[PDB]
Design a protein around this ligand. Sequence first.
Ligand SMILES: [Mg+2]
Length: 800
Amino acid sequence: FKPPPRPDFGTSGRTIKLQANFFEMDIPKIDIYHYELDIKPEKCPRRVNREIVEHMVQHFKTQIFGDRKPVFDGRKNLYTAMPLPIGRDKVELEVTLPDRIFKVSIKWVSCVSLQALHDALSGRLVPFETIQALDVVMRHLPSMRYTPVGRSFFTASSNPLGGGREVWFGFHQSVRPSLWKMMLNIDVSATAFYKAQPVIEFVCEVLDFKSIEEQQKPLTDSQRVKFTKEIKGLKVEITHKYRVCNVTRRPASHQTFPLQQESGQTVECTVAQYFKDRHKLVLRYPHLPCLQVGQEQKHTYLPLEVCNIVAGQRCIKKLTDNQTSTMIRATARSAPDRQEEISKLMRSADFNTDPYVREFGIMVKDEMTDVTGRVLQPPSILYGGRNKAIATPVQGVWDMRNKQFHTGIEIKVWAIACFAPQRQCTEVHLKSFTEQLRKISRDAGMPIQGQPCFCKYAQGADSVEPMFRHLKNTYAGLQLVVVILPGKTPVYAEVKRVGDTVLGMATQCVQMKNVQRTTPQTLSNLCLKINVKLGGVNNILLPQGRPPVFQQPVIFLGADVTHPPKKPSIAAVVGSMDAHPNRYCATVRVQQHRQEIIQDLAAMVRELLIQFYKSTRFKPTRIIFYRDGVSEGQFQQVLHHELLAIREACIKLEKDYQPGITFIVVQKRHHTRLFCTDKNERVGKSGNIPAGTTVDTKITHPTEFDFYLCSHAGIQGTSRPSHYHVLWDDNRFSSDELQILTYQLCHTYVRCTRSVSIPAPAYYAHLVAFRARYHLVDDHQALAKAVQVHQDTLRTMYFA
RNA sequence: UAC
Ligand SMILES: [Mg+2]
């Protein structure tokens, strides 16, 4: 029901001086006053409402507001520093915007006690409405100055991404509680928007046209479908605002609509003819389709040449890899650089001279918060082979030189399928590839004995299944099929579909591009996934160097949801199947569109418990549950349902079975940044904090059990420390034990010899759902059937 | 193949 209080403050690890992008706020103790606004029409966008309120305050200045500067949230709530002279009773007013008349009623609703909040920060376990009030106050002005996106703000600076897209720089701002004081979280952000250009040029940039003069013919269906999928849902505006709901198949010269003549009779009329009659405009490009806007019952069609893409539209649809890369190159910068940019941002914002921040007596410190962090000692890693070499993670990174796999799978029989055109990928390529791969393999501890028994060329996904159907039937004990493919191709999905869901064979693909030039590290990293794909163990945590939670049987779960770019959401939960913990088992379900809550969690947890008991012959006395990607506002419901789901999964097994459940939420999408005070502590060109820095003081929840942990070594840009919030804990973990455990689990990721940002279970869950995505593409019964995995595939970490 |  309620998250546990904080048990203790972690004392383990080596102390480090840090600075967090949290800026202390001096909050007065006075009572803010809360008024409610009912504006009609009631479905106006927040910006219009803000303009209405502005003009309202400036208009009724004489009898209502006076010299007071109230702050507005864009919806229905208006706050004032000192009370409005209206009393309890509701007042109605009219506000005219320069041609429209708005009826705005204002009635006093409540009082916001800043003292209650102040005291909550000091042992009176926190009012959300007060924090939200402060938020409104702090972001009243930037909301009117810039383009608000969630808790961020953006503007237009000439930073093309291509695709009709652009880069907008801005910032994130959020009022946040912390022990004792109120913090202002300020970070530099940037996101993708759509350019303010004519739809013609949009078509040009989407279909790679240098000019609209080319393609002097009607569009390929191929093209229409792409442009349709690009512009659908976007707002346009007439050059003489509408919402594009569809794109016509027929050109503007032939696309018709029911036109009512003055006699009353209706006759079908072409868009071109209508624009020639009504607007005296002859379409220059009548061969091009139309944009169906508004209601589909309205039958409203607009030619492309008379529409412009409305400025300020954030790009939500998934970015291409090149666009994403460009975004990275434009946004990524070292930690000191980002810190300086946040400083310039604070200087530019100048909260202390803000009329509204002044009005409410709020004051913001210009210095980042001094926080003392602790670099946790990393776990050693035990490898196998003759040596049984122990590797020590230096800066969250280690290697496999003079090291073999823990239990390297002896590869005797295996096949090679190349879908690469043989001109591009030739016999000698395959030979040098298998040669190099074998040397690196023997050096890795997973010996691929003998040349490949099978090795053939093929093309088209249509031939994937039967080829496999042949292999499994002609080679006894066939362990692995190495599939070679060039560039983007749906054959990967087919190979994964048949391989994981149909026949149950381990498949390891390589890009054709990476076949010809082989680097020892690439091949080694390939073997890392190949070994775990065959059920082997690459490496384990040092047994003696582990938290006491491993004293009695414990299962580690990792859950995540993934949402579609009608298409269902994918829920994925994985569980540890040994005591290392290395090998994991996977469960995956399809569920309601954009439903974050794992609906069928109980069945999955039950299934994982069953597999655990089958693999270890033990009933886990403790269940550790790492939940990914849950907003701070969705906590109570996801906890209420999923905790009861795990509990019910335990009860459905046995009446007496009640293991301790630790419900933890891992957040990676936040704006908490940590910087090194001493330049001697900076690591790499990024200048980031080292791998293992843990912050559970100062900027963390005043009462609850939460902590920041930066388990990964920043390679590029500024590191984002993973936040962990303990929603439940029957096991009564200490801060040190839980933080160390969470840190050590980040070293159990098998796809790389380095510490990752989030623990292996959550990452694995993400991989499972991401694989289910490819399992889908190729009614609920059929989907759940297509996502289900072959039983022989099930034991093994196929998602690796 | 591995933010
Ligand atoms: Mg997720």
